[PDB]
Amino acid sequence: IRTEKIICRDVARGYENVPIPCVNGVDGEPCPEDYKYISENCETSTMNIDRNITHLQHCTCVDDCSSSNCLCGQLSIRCWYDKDGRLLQEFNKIEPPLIFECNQACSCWRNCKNRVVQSGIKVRLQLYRTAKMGWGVRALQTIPQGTFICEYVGELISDAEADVREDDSYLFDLDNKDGEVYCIDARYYGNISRFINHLCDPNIIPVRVFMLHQDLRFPRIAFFSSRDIRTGEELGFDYGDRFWDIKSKYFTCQCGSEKCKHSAEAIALEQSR
């Protein structure tokens, strides 16, 4: 019987609020080292992100930003965070709105209620070896619905550069329209999110968020729990059909859910007709 071994005390090397250990109880694969762990997005060519402080929409609140008069909340119709930093039950999880958190131009304090994603990781997570899907990430605690989990962090690149990247297993499109659109590639530079697997029955959702800038080309991708999550549960999002239409020639989905839409069996069935 193989033991489970702790093979890294913290894959983030102290960069996150909490350690993110790595274990393997499945095989002899050592801790993954073929990428650079970064806690915030990086650039490898000039993106000219708009960082002019005078371009920031910002609030005039001197309370904790919980009133309906917070301009930053209003930019998403309303602030969607409850008093404990969780998305409201009524949050639209099908078509999430863009969230504008408070920033350095706001009159409020750094611990106002509209600063969840910019405050970082609070849940305890673990990088672990799965049976069939290489490395994945699981929760070491219960996680209520609406809780911020982590950000999809990597190398910012153009759509054109994304199209010529040889390894396409860690790309995330920031915008689904065409034209001047950008992507995060977590292949070479990434955080814990690079190890989150696709699940046909997902328990987390990606939400576009603005914090220190408001350049609409460069939303930051925040994962929140879409339901209550149990201790030990693998975290997963729906990578979408713009991933699977390409990747399913090379492999099929192993999520094992009765709802699976991308297993060999599912594809074979649809093919039949």
């Binding site: 994304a162 010529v164 396409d168 499109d173 689904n176 713009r242 390409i246």
Partner: peptide, 8 residues
């Protein structure tokens, strides 16, 4: 597209 990308 040419390469696979996750997306919302």
């Amino acid at each position: 597209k040419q390469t696979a990308r996750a997306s919302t």
